[PDB]
Amino acid sequence: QACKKHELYVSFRDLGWQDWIIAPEGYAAYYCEGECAFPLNSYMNATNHAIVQTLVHFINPETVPKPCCAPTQLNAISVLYFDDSSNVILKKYRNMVVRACGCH
Amino acid sequence: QACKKHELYVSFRDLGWQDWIIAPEGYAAYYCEGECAFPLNSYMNATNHAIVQTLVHFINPETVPKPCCAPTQLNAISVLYFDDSSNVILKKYRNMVVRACGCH
Amino acid sequence: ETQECLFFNANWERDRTNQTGVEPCYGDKDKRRHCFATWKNISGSIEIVKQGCWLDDINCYDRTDCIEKKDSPEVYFCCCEGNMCNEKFSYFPE
Amino acid sequence: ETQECLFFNANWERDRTNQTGVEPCYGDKDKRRHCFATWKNISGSIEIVKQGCWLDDINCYDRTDCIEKKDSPEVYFCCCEGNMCNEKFSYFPE
Numbered sequence: 001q002a003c004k005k006h007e008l009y010v011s012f013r014d015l016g017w018q019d020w021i022i023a024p025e026g027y028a029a030y031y032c033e034g035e036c037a038f039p040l041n042s043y044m045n046a047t048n049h050a051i052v053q054t055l056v057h058f059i060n061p062e063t064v065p066k067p068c069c070a071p072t073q074l075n076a077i078s079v080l081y082f083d084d085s086s087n088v089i090l091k092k093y094r095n096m097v098v099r100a101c102g103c104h
Numbered sequence: 105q106a107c108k109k110h111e112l113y114v115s116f117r118d119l120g121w122q123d124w125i126i127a128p129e130g131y132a133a134y135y136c137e138g139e140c141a142f143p144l145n146s147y148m149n150a151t152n153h154a155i156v157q158t159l160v161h162f163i164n165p166e167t168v169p170k171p172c173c174a175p176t177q178l179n180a181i182s183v184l185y186f187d188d189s190s191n192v193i194l195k196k197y198r199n200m201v202v203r204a205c206g207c208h
Numbered sequence: 209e210t211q212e213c214l215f216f217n218a219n220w221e222r223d224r225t226n227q228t229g230v231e232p233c234y235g236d237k238d239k240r241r242h243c244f245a246t247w248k249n250i251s252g253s254i255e256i257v258k259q260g261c262w263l264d265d266i267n268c269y270d271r272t273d274c275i276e277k278k279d280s281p282e283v284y285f286c287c288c289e290g291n292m293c294n295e296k297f298s299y300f301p302e
Numbered sequence: 303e304t305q306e307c308l309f310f311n312a313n314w315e316r317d318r319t320n321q322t323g324v325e326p327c328y329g330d331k332d333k334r335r336h337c338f339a340t341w342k343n344i345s346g347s348i349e350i351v352k353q354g355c356w357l358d359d360i361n362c363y364d365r366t367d368c369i370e371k372k373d374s375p376e377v378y379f380c381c382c383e384g385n386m387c388n389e390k391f392s393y394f395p396e
């Protein structure tokens with residue numbers, strides 16, 4: 001129930017991309033998911049904007065929704081893929097891995 | 105439907121806090137809200153982590169959910185409030201205003 | 209727009225700021241800035257508590273004079289736009 | 303842990319990097335780092351394409367030798383943990 005990071009491995013095979021990425025085969029990507037509610041404590045890594053909106057909710061849940069649990073900290077991974085010319089290429093991709101979740 | 109910033113004014117009166125904050129009386133706070141879907145374009149200010157998770161969804165919506173629209177850019181506001189000793193105090197609060205939304 | 213305000217700090221000794229001077233709003237076209245002033249009114253006697261720049265506030269949008277409109281406030285506060293607008297402030301209930 | 307890898311870049315001239323040397327993994331206890339190596343195997347003849355550090359990858363966790371396990375790959379790639387582990391690499395299908 002509470003907002004928490006959960007596991008999820010992506011596989012570039014499955015993703016369809018198997019012929020272009022050379023590595024890795026898939027990665028530990030993860031994802032957030034969970035309720036983010038009153039009284040929103042520590043370990044929900046929330047923003048003020050979030051606390052306010054949380055109470056706003058709690059008064060008129062009819063107005064703004066509760067905030068969503070979503071990453072606050074992401075890592076890059078590396079990949080090796082082929083280019084149009086079939087050169088081998090290494091590039092690191094920013095924000096692919098979820099390091100930690102929170103209220104937004 | 106699409107993820108978009110929407111208006112929301114908070115009022116410290118209503119919030120209950122009227123006797124402690126001296127100013128302002130309430131503020132333009134805003135909030136995100138909207139679907140974030142396939143094929144997630146520009147103006148959804150999404151993260152790679154988000155695009156992946158979006159497709160992951162689209163293959164097995166049974167695994168990870170779609171990402172949530174939530175702020176990517178927040179402003180501080182100032183407030184003036186009284187302290188235990190009733191001194192007047194000014195402090196700026198980080199992340200209270202939503203400047204822009206996106207997919208997370 | 210507002211690049212600077214009149215700054216005053218009652219509590220300058222403890223806060224380690226100067227007591228007056230002009231404060232730069234660091235107002236650069238993304239977010240607005242205003243000036244403000246807060247003071248006490250002991251029976252027509254007036255003492256300034258604070259005066260400065262003030263992050264974007266939809267309440268003092270389109271305000272070029274500092275008039276406070278709250279009935280008999282414990283502390284008077286007002287903001288306006290426009291350089292040193294905070295220089296003089298006034299009171300006129302609604 | 304891994305502080306450095308053997309670095310090699312086939313494409314050093316166009317990329318403007320050196321062609322070899324040791325590359326610092328900038329591996330500091332938050333996220334892991336590994337080394338990797340990718341090379342071509344024209345019939346037992348072997349040419350390295352790239353060799354370097356490699357951001358945290360749950361696939362090369364607990365790996366101290368570089369053995370590639372894919373059948374007859376267009377390009378061979380492997381990673382391991384441990385300094386200069388990338389120094390030598392090997393091939394052994396599953």
Ligand SMILES: *[C@@H]1O[C@H](CO)[C@@H](O[C@@H]2O[C@H](CO)[C@@H](O[C@@H]3O[C@H](CO[C@H]4O[C@H](CO)[C@@H](O)[C@H](O)[C@@H]4O)[C@@H](O[C@@H]4O[C@H](CO)[C@@H](O)[C@H](O)[C@@H]4O)[C@H](O[C@H]4O[C@H](CO)[C@@H](O)[C@H](O)[C@@H]4O)[C@@H]3O)[C@H](O)[C@H]2NC(C)=O)[C@H](O)[C@H]1NC(C)=O
Pocket residue numbers: 003004005043044045100101102
């Ligand atoms: C706000 O931000 C903070 C960080 O900025 C986030 O807090 C973070 O919470 C996570 C959980 O996702 C922490 O990481 C995990 O910690 C658990 C706890 O186990 C620990 O305790 C034992 C003590 O006996 C220690 O020996 C260990 O060193 C360990 O750190 C850890 O083990 C878990 O076991 C339980 C079941 O008993 C499970 O519920 C967990 O899923 C987990 O398995 C975790 O290890 C596992 O998961 C990681 C990936 O997350 C794998 O790589 C491991 O191999 C293993 O499978 C894991 O390390 C994180 O450290 C913590 N940050 C802090 C406080 O330092 C908050 O999450 C964030 N708020 C929200 C809502 O996310």
Ligand SMILES: *[C@@H]1O[C@H](CO)[C@@H](O[C@@H]2O[C@H](CO)[C@@H](O[C@@H]3O[C@H](CO[C@H]4O[C@H](CO)[C@@H](O)[C@H](O)[C@@H]4O)[C@@H](O[C@@H]4O[C@H](CO)[C@@H](O)[C@H](O)[C@@H]4O)[C@H](O[C@H]4O[C@H](CO)[C@@H](O)[C@H](O)[C@@H]4O)[C@@H]3O)[C@H](O)[C@H]2NC(C)=O)[C@H](O)[C@H]1NC(C)=O
Pocket residue numbers: 107108109147148149204205206
């Ligand atoms: C990804 O990030 C980017 C920014 O990093 C975000 O894009 C941003 O979108 C917002 C919308 O929330 C932009 O601000 C708004 O723009 C509208 C459009 O009107 C413009 O066009 C006319 C041209 O004829 C110009 O003259 C104007 O200068 C103006 O900029 C603007 O007016 C709107 O009117 C329509 C109806 O016709 C409404 O749908 C809008 O709500 C709006 O009223 C907006 O002004 C209004 O709203 C603001 C507060 O947002 C008030 O302060 C105003 O007084 C007024 O009420 C508003 O300026 C923003 O600039 C834009 N960033 C870019 C591209 O530069 C994306 O939103 C984000 N992705 C997501 C999902 O959020």
Ligand SMILES: *[C@@H]1O[C@H](CO)[C@@H](O)[C@H](O)[C@H]1NC(C)=O
Pocket residue numbers: 248249250251252253254284297298299
């Ligand atoms: C101060 O209060 C007096 C009456 O005590 C009022 O008429 C005057 O306008 C006030 N001055 C301020 C703060 O504007």
Ligand SMILES: *[C@@H]1O[C@H](CO)[C@@H](O)[C@H](O)[C@H]1NC(C)=O
Pocket residue numbers: 342343344345346347348378391392393
């Ligand atoms: C290279 O391929 C040969 C056969 O062509 C194989 O036996 C050898 O182990 C491979 N070397 C590598 C890349 O490990």
Ligand SMILES: *[C@H]1O[C@H](CO)[C@@H](O)[C@H](O)[C@H]1NC(C)=O
Pocket residue numbers: 215225226228229230231
């Ligand atoms: C006084 O303190 C600094 C130190 O030089 C001075 O330059 C500045 O103009 C004053 N302070 C403020 C907050 O305006």
Ligand SMILES: *[C@H]1O[C@H](CO)[C@@H](O)[C@H](O)[C@H]1NC(C)=O
Pocket residue numbers: 309319320322323324325
């Ligand atoms: C070679 O280029 C720099 C310039 O001095 C050198 O110091 C470094 O050790 C080499 N490059 C790499 C990527 O390892």
